[PDB]
Design a protein around this ligand. Structure first.
Ligand SMILES: Cc1cc(NC(=O)c2cccc(C(F)(F)F)c2)ccc1Oc1ncccc1-c1ccncn1
Length: 246
């Protein structure tokens, strides 16, 4: 597949991202709407992530789940690098959260399900993320979660990763479920030093409205020791999840 800028019509900007802007785009050849991201070699090289881009781009190129933002392909030219992505209309979970303040059990439980489902999928292919934050979570037309973290902020980093295998993403689901119901990440502090401290000591408390079913599931996810964290299956089978998911 030989792709090229000339193969798309560029529409409105879709905001800025680390290392380049994303644009709404339509394939002249297909009329198909999607998202185009432009990255600059110079900025990628400068700061050492040019190896990650290929590494993840390659891996991300083989994932196929309704809850994983798809990458139909990539290409470059002399100075820039282009990623062709699926277009998620409803924005980022991070935006919806600060708009709504927080999510109720139904919304949370349904997102966690979708998240656990994509992660289950990724596991069978030995694919882990190592950093799942709300701003990298996009929403489709039916409001379904779409992970756009070409996996392969200390707020969403597990202890073993700041002091690992696929146990990391369980800790990820733990942080997210909390942030969704409560409106903020569990180890969030005023200093970056105390956040590091809170994460390592795994100390968080729940606001009175968070239910027991939710506390159980989160308390089992946020374990300092990774082997003690449940498995995706257990999560998707959790009583709280099952009773509140769409
Ligand atoms: C979320 C996202 C992540 C990447 N991520 C990378 O390109 C990337 C991944 C891994 C590593 C790196 C490295 F290393 F260069 F830093 C970069 C690229 C495009 C992305 O989508 C958007 N971003 C900003 C605004 C809007 C969207 C969007 C897309 C589709 N529909 C609706 N909105």
């Amino acid at each position: 597949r030989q792709w090229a800028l000339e193969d798309f019509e560029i529409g409105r900007p879709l905001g800025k991202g680390k290392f380049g802007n994303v644009y709404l785009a339509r394939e002249k050849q297909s009329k198909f709407i999607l998202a185009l991201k432009v990255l600059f070699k110079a900025q990628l090289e400068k700061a050492g992530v040019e190896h990650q881009l290929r590494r993840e781009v390659e891996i991300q190129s083989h994932l196929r789940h309704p809850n994983i933002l798809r990458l139909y392909g990539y290409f470059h030219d002399a100075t820039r690098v282009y990623l062709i992505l699926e277009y998620a209309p409803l924005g980022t979970v991070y935006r919806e959260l600060q708009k709504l303040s927080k999510f109720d059990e139904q919304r949370t439980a349904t997102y966690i399900t979708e998240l656990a489902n994509a992660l289950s999928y990724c596991h069978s292919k030995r694919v882990i993320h190592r950093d799942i934050k709300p701003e990298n979570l996009l929403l489709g037309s039916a409001g379904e979660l779409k992970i756009a973290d070409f996996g392969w902020t200390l707020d969403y980093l597990p202890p073993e990763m700041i002091e690992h295998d696929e146990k990391v993403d369980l800790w990820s689901l733990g942080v997210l479920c909390y942030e969704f119901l409560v409106g903020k990440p569990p180890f969030e502090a005023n200093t970056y030093q105390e956040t590091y401290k809170r994460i390592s000591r795994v100390e968080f408390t729940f606001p009175d409205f968070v239910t027991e079913g939710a506390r159980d599931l989160i308390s089992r996810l946020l374990k300092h020791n990774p082997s003690q964290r449940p498995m995706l299956r257990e999560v998707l089978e959790h009583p709280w999840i099952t009773a509140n998911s769409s």
